[PDB]
């Protein structure tokens, strides 16, 4: 049997990797960060409340100027907010009301959105006539779009529910690279600060590190027990954090190739929907299904605070590039800024 | 003068929220529905009775606008994209009653069980279309297909007294099609604290009364939603 022979040779390769990872596990992260000072209680107040959307907010994304943010809601609207003055800059009606992700271009000239329509629609904000129009639609994917992120004005990376991630040329509208290897719906992706790599977590309880230029899977990270819903890179780009349905957040190191820390509590029995780091990476903010976001000490694995101002499931959350505020959207149709 | 830029911001925000309340009136007036069903169930025949990753069908019954969404070009792993439909008025779950000999009926009983007990779909009512009743009748009328093989509790099942048989139909078809309904109603009544309900209907794919069944069931769902806001029920 050639099939079983390939199955047993994969088992020995998994045992070789598992023992090579254990040889590097000399000390735990809790043993290294034992004597550092705890952060203390993190008391954060709601500074702004954005009350424009009609349905549940599924995604949001900050602009690189740390003042404007885009918000996607399943009533079919993309609202650009001025977070300082709470004013609405733009309101884009979408063709599909089932948007599940939205991105803000680093240049600030474009926004993207996608969902169950399996299409990533690029919207040009800086149009000559002055009002936003759809400039491009990317229709290669065969499953729902879970996440999309801009590399530059002409490149965008999208993860989809067809267990595949893809890289797109925007002016030509064609897939330039496809990333295969996941066996479940890829739920999120996170670009590295250098944007040479990105990490994606799927519904196979696994996360994979991809090389953008070569389109290959570099490393595979296991340890979770259920589907990974959210993922976020560490500020330096040498680690990332995953949130899963097993009610646990975990921190994985790229160079160690294994998980370093686990963020769990016996009272927490709901899955994580969003994760984000602070500007320094000391705090790990995670949105949960129990309607409140918890702040974790990323080094001590101790809960440092709670953001309990939302009346429904916290679906998205993001920290500004300058680190000044945190914006959390939720299914209660509101978006709150915390500081 | 920086005050000019902020006055231009207030006038731009003023134009947007003028449009956002025009869209609020349209959004609240429309009633969204999720048409869910497996293959070989007659689901696609109902939308013709009235690639892309989701198909939208707009219809209007008694000046009330309904927006029905049919999931297409998606994998059979539904546990993620099914959460997007927690705010719909009802989920139209289409089942093939003739498919019990595989055992597609047990596959649909487990899918209905997962939808009923999902934490995000616990307030979403389900409109159950026990489709393919015309094909079930021909299958039951013959002695070749015995539902006792795939469901051994059918050997002691008796038709309930409240069962209303269609005019001029076999009791063996009445007992068969009502047994299948009780298999779904046993799951529906096992859990649920009055938050959501199940509305079973004996359906054919070519039936014209299908849009009126959804209209009358959605009118019940909205009515119970109003009664719950006043703590009356």
């Amino acid at each position, epitope marked *: 049997s050639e099939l079983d022979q390939l*199955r047993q040779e994969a088992e020995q390769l*998994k045992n070789q990797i*598992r023992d090579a990872r254990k040889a590097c596990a000399d000390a735990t992260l809790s043993q290294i960060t034992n004597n550092i000072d705890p952060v203390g209680r993190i008391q954060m107040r709601t500074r702004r409340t954005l009350r424009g959307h009609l349905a549940k907010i599924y995604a949001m994304h900050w602009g690189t100027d740390s003042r404007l943010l885009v918000s996607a809601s399943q009533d079919g609207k993309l609202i650009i907010w001025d977070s300082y003055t709470t004013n609405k800059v733009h309101a884009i009606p979408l063709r599909s009301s089932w948007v599940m992700t939205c991105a803000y271009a680093p240049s600030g000239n474009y926004v993207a959105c996608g969902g169950l329509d399996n299409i990533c629609s690029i919207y040009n904000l800086k149009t000559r006539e002055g009002n936003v129009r759809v400039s491009r639609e990317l229709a290669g994917h065969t499953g729902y779009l879970s996440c999309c992120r801009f590399l530059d004005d002409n490149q965008i990376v999208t993860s989809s529910g067809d*267990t595949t991630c893809a890289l797109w040329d925007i002016e030509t509208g064609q897939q330039t690279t496809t990333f295969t290897g996941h*066996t*479940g719906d890829v739920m999120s992706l996170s670009l590295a600060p250098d944007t040479r790599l990105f990490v994606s977590g799927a*519904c*196979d*309880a696994s996360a994979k590190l991809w090389d953008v230029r070569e389109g290959m899977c570099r490393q595979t990270f*296991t*340890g979770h*027990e*259920s*589907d990974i819903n959210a993922i976020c890179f560490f500020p330096n780009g040498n680690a990332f954090a995953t949130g899963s*349905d*097993d*009610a646990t957040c975990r921190l994985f190191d790229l160079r160690a190739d294994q998980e370093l820390m686990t963020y769990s509590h016996d009272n927490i*029995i709901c*899955g994580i929907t969003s994760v984000s780091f602070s500007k320094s990476g000391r705090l790990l903010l995670a949105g949960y299904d129990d309607f409140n976001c918890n702040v974790w000490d990323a080094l001590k694995a101790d809960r440092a605070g709670v953001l309990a101002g939302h009346d429904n499931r916290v679906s998205c959350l993001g920290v500004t590039d300058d680190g000044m505020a945190v914006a959390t959207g939720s299914w209660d149709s509101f978006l709150k800024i915390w500081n | 003068d920086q005050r000019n830029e902020e006055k231009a911001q207030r006038e731009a925000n003023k134009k947007i929220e003028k449009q956002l309340q025009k869209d609020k009136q349209v959004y609240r007036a429309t009633h969204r529905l999720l048409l869910l069903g497996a293959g070989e169930s007659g689901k696609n025949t109902i939308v013709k009775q009235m690639t892309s990753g989701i198909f939208e069908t707009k219809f209007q019954v008694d000046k009330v606008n309904f927006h029905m969404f049919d999931v297409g070009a998606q*994998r*059979d*792993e*539904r*546990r993620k994209w*099914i959460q997007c439909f927690n705010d719909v008025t009802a989920i139209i779950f289409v089942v093939a009653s003739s498919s019990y000999n*595989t*055992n597609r009926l*047990q*596959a649909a009983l*487990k899918l209905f*069980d*997962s*939808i*009923w*007990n*999902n*934490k995000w779909l616990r307030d979403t009512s389900v409109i159950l279309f026990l489709n393919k009743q015309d094909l079930l009748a021909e299958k039951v009328l013959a002695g070749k297909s015995k539902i006792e*093989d*795939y*469901f*051994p*509790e059918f050997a002691r099942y008796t038709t309930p007294e409240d069962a209303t048989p269609e005019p001029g139909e076999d009791p063996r078809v009445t007992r068969a099609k009502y047994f299948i309904r009780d298999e779904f109603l046993r799951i529906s009544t096992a*859990s649920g604290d009055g938050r959501h309900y199940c509305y079973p209907h004996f359906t054919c794919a070519v039936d014209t009364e299908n849009i009126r069944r959804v209209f009358n069931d959605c009118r019940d769902i909205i009515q119970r939603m109003h009664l719950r806001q006043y703590e009356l029920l």
Partner: nanobody
Amino acid sequence: QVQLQESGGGLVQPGGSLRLSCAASGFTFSNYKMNWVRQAPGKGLEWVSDISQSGASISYTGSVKGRFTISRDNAKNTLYLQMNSLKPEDTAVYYCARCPAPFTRDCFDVTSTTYAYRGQGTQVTVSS
């Protein structure tokens, strides 16, 4: 690393008995509902039996009621399936399937064609 390994199987005479075992690793066995599914030659995945987190609620597919018995040992992290009065229609590859999320009443996508939290299966052949 969630791993499910099934042991047992083999060629049985009609009316014989067999006991399938499922060794689970990589997760908390007691927090999840366990399932049994099979795939007959030239057919799709078919759900057989399930057992709750504790072991109180037990459900069977109609074809196997009275002949099959599902059991879980939360201490040893094992799932059992005592198969009695085996018919030639029982010949299939029996997979040990795990529910996708813990502490949930719903069990989604267990009989999918590509499901992660499912073992590779054991071949059970009932013949003479």
